[PDB]
Amino acid sequence: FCRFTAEGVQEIDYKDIATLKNYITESGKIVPSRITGTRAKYQRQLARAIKRARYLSLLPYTDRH
Amino acid sequence: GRPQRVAQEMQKEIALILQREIKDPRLGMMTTVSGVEMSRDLAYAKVYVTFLNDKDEDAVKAGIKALQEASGFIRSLLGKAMRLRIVPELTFFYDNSLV
Amino acid sequence: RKQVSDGVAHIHASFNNTIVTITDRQGNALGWATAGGSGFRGSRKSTPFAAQVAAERCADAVKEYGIKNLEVMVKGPGPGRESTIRALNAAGFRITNITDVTPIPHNGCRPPKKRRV
Amino acid sequence: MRHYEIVFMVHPDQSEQVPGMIERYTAAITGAEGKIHRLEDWGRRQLAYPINKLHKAHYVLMNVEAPQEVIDELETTFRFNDAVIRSMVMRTKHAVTEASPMVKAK
Amino acid sequence: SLSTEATAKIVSEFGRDANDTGSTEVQVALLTAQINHLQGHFAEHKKDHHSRRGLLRMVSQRRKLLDYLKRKDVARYTQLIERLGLRR
RNA sequence: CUUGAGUCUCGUAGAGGGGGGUAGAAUUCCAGGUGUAGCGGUGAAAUGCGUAGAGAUCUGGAGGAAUACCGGUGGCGAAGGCGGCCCCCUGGACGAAGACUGACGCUCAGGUGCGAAAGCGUGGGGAGCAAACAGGAUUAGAUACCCUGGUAGUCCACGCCGUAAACGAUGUCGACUUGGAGGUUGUGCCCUUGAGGCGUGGCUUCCGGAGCUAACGCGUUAAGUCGACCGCCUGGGGAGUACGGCCGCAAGGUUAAAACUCAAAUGAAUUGACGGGGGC
Numbered sequence: 244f245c246r247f248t249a250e251g252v253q254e255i256d257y258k259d260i261a262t263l264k265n266y267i268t269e270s271g272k273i274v275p276s277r278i279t280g281t282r283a284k285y286q287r288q289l290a291r292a293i294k295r296a297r298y299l300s301l302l303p304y305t306d307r308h
Numbered sequence: 309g310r311p312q313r314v315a316q317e318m319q320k321e322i323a324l325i326l327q328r329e330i331k332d333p334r335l336g337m338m339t340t341v342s343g344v345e346m347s348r349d350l351a352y353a354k355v356y357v358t359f360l361n362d363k364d365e366d367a368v369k370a371g372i373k374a375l376q377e378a379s380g381f382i383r384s385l386l387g388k389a390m391r392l393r394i395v396p397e398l399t400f401f402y403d404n405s406l407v
Numbered sequence: 408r409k410q411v412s413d414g415v416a417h418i419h420a421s422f423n424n425t426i427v428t429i430t431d432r433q434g435n436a437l438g439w440a441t442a443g444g445s446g447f448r449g450s451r452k453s454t455p456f457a458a459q460v461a462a463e464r465c466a467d468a469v470k471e472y473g474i475k476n477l478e479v480m481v482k483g484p485g486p487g488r489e490s491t492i493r494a495l496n497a498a499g500f501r502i503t504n505i506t507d508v509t510p511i512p513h514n515g516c517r518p519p520k521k522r523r524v
Numbered sequence: 525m526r527h528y529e530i531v532f533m534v535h536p537d538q539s540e541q542v543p544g545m546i547e548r549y550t551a552a553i554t555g556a557e558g559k560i561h562r563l564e565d566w567g568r569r570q571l572a573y574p575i576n577k578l579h580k581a582h583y584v585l586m587n588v589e590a591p592q593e594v595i596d597e598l599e600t601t602f603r604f605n606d607a608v609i610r611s612m613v614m615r616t617k618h619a620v621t622e623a624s625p626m627v628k629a630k
Numbered sequence: 631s632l633s634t635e636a637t638a639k640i641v642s643e644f645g646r647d648a649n650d651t652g653s654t655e656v657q658v659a660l661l662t663a664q665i666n667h668l669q670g671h672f673a674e675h676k677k678d679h680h681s682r683r684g685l686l687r688m689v690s691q692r693r694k695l696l697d698y699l700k701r702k703d704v705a706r707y708t709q710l711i712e713r714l715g716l717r718r
Numbered sequence: 719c720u721u722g723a724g725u726c727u728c729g730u731a732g733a734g735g736g737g738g739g740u741a742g743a744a745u746u747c748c749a750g751g752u753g754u755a756g757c758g759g760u761g762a763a764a765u766g767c768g769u770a771g772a773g774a775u776c777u778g779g780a781g782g783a784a785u786a787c788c789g790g791u792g793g794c795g796a797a798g799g800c801g802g803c804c805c806c807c808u809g810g811a812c813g814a815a816g817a818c819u820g821a822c823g824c825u826c827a828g829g830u831g832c833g834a835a836a837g838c839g840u841g842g843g844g845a846g847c848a849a850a851c852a853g854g855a856u857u858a859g860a861u862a863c864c865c866u867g868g869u870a871g872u873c874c875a876c877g878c879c880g881u882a883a884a885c886g887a888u889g890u891c892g893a894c895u896u897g898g899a900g901g902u903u904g905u906g907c908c909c910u911u912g913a914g915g916c917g918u919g920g921c922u923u924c925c926g927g928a929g930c931u932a933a934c935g936c937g938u939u940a941a942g943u944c945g946a947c948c949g950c951c952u953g954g955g956g957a958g959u960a961c962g963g964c965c966g967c968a969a970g971g972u973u974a975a976a977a978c979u980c981a982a983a984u985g986a987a988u989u990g991a992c993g994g995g996g997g998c
């Protein structure tokens with residue numbers, strides 16, 4: 244439902260933890276655009292971005308760690 | 309085939325799909341299946357599932373229909389999970405596990 | 408001997424087997440309950456009722472150190488696991504939280520073939 | 525030289541050399557046509573997940589149009605050296621000199 | 631693959647002018663340079679058959695051009711073949 | 719001659735490829751700690767396995783293997799196919815815009831490659847898994863299925879091998895002809911403008927008209943209309959066989975008979991019966 248387009252970012256800087264946290268569950272699983280209604284490329288950009296931030300320790304693989 | 313024997317194997321498969329593969333969970337809980345009652349030839353499976361939803365038909369009803377509404381989709385799931393030509397008809401029952 | 412007062416137990420909510428253990432707050436698990444160990448075997452060890460009754464074996468160790476709080480974990484989706492949690496609430500020990508921590512991998516381990524009719 | 529955005533952390537405890545090693549690293553940048561288009565440090569920040577049983581790692585960032593080789597020895601250095609505790613190196617389409625979500629909080 | 635700058639250097643001499651970009655010569659020269667860049671990749675990466683697939687797509691291409699040129703003016707062909715040091 | 723063809727410049731997405739890194743779970747092992755009486759197995763046991771203290775828990779390590787969510791008609795590809803993150807190398811696609819070249823084309827026998835898994839070779843490597851084989855649970859054919867183990871294999875590197883229902887069971891290219899709903903990814907315009915309104919490309923999907931089809935259906939991503947080239951078949955069984963060649967180290971593949979035999983083989987649909995089914 245065109246919310247990333249409202250933000251206006253064709254390329255999403257991955258360092259945006261606040262947006263990433265909304266797209267991340269308490270477990271840390273990525274919510275799909277089925278419910279978030281985000282377009283695929285951003286969906287694509289976010290999934291790769293979450294892993295790299297997770298590698299940098301910005302995002303938790305899972306709280307249990 | 310032999311229903312009382314295949315029941316143990318099917319219950320494990322039913323639990324795995326129920327817990328990790330849900331996106332319309334009115335239960336929103338770890339609902340646990342007490343038992344299953346497959347017919348001869350496994351044509352019909354009766355799944356008796358208890359609800360971690362405070363054991364009140366109010367919350368339980370939300371899921372049992374949710375259990376029934378997504379059956380064809382979940383049918384595929386269990387239907388492509390034990391190489392079964394019989395995809396069991398799915399039925400759901402809150403169990404009075406507590407009396 | 409030494410009081411802990413902050414209960415922390417580990418259960419193994421497997422299908423064919425049902426076993427709880429008592430743990431110290433800093434790991435160091437101390438004492439345990441095996442429903443199979445009660446003499447229940449086969450279907451009887453797996454019965455949800457056996458898991459519910461196994462509370463007394465867990466309770467006696469908890470009573471020896473007199474621990475009260477409840478921070479316990481569930482690993483494995485055992486049949487009627489919620490009923491076992493109800494039995495722990497029926498006991499009336501103060502409950503702080505229960506953790507649904509069935510371990511999920513990334514598919515790294517190779518699974519073994521499923522059994523067939 | 526080509527664009528990059530680079531971030532790593534040094535063990536928080538070894539922060540004595542953290543201010544100098546940066547430019548001591550940019551010795552490569554400053555000494556091999558390194559056009560550092562931006563650099564950021566954030567300081568000790570609690571790790572979301574512990575790495576090597578460590579917490580509050582010393583966060584730092586770099587933005588350079590750098591040649592193919594310099595980055596290599598630069599990261600092998602990190603691969604070589606041990607004060608650093610984890611590393612990362614990613615190419616960027618263009619140079620980024622805008623407040624980053626870490627600093628933009630300030 | 632290439633650098634636009636190398637393509638511009640080839641276009642300036644092989645082409646009559648910078649705009650002259652379709653001339654068979656200006657075409658085969660670019661293909662030959664591309665093959666040389668791919669050959670360096672294959673020296674350590676023999677496994678990368680997938681990239682070899684394109685490699686074929688061009689050696690044959692000029693091969694068609696050569697003929698098309700050769701059947702058009704051997705004059706340029708004759709010099710081209712030796713200009714590009716090919717078919718020696 | 720320039721629209722076919724192709725180049726340049728501008729981008730643009732993509733599990734494309736090759737290499738090298740690297741992460742986190744998981745599993746096993748090992749370390750400890752605390753902590754035991756079991757444990758796991760079945761329908762039940764057996765089988766396994768525990769006071770050496772197992773089983774459980776944390777803490778640690780080692781190893782190998784694979785990359786959850788995302789993630790799906792979603793892409794990438796000639797196809798087989800491609801699924802953690804990073805970097806190096808590299809193929810192709812596409813849009814826009816303009817120029818350049820000027821028929822530079824298509825198909826392809828022969829040809830040369832490409833190539834799922836298992837398999838062969840050498841040396842590797844060894845989590846987990848699992849043919850073979852092994853212990854307990856047997857007689858309608860138990861020769862068992864089930865559990866307990868388990869080597870090769872499964873991974874690597876280099877080799878061979880060259881087949882799979884390698885399947886859209888639909889050769890390649892080009893042109894022509896009603897719709898609608900999607901997806902995807904371009905990009906123009908016009909709205910501030912998201913959204914919105916006009917577009918306009920690419921690719922993909924589901925209906926579906928006409929048309930075609932034995933029927934089934936197909937249906938602008940035609941099985942409609944056409945064109946060009948290639949490939950193939952001629953009742954069924956014997957039979958993709960004997961044998962000969964070729965290839966392969968083998969395994970083996972490839973090539974491909976004939977003898978004899980028969981009145982059908984066989985496709986789609988249709989109507990019913992039954993049942994070891996279930997709803998009302």
Ligand SMILES: [Mg+2]
Binds near residue numbers: 872
């Ligand atoms: Mg293999």
Ligand SMILES: [Mg+2]
Binds near residue numbers: 882
């Ligand atoms: Mg075949």
Ligand SMILES: [Mg+2]
Binds near residue numbers: 884
């Ligand atoms: Mg296939």
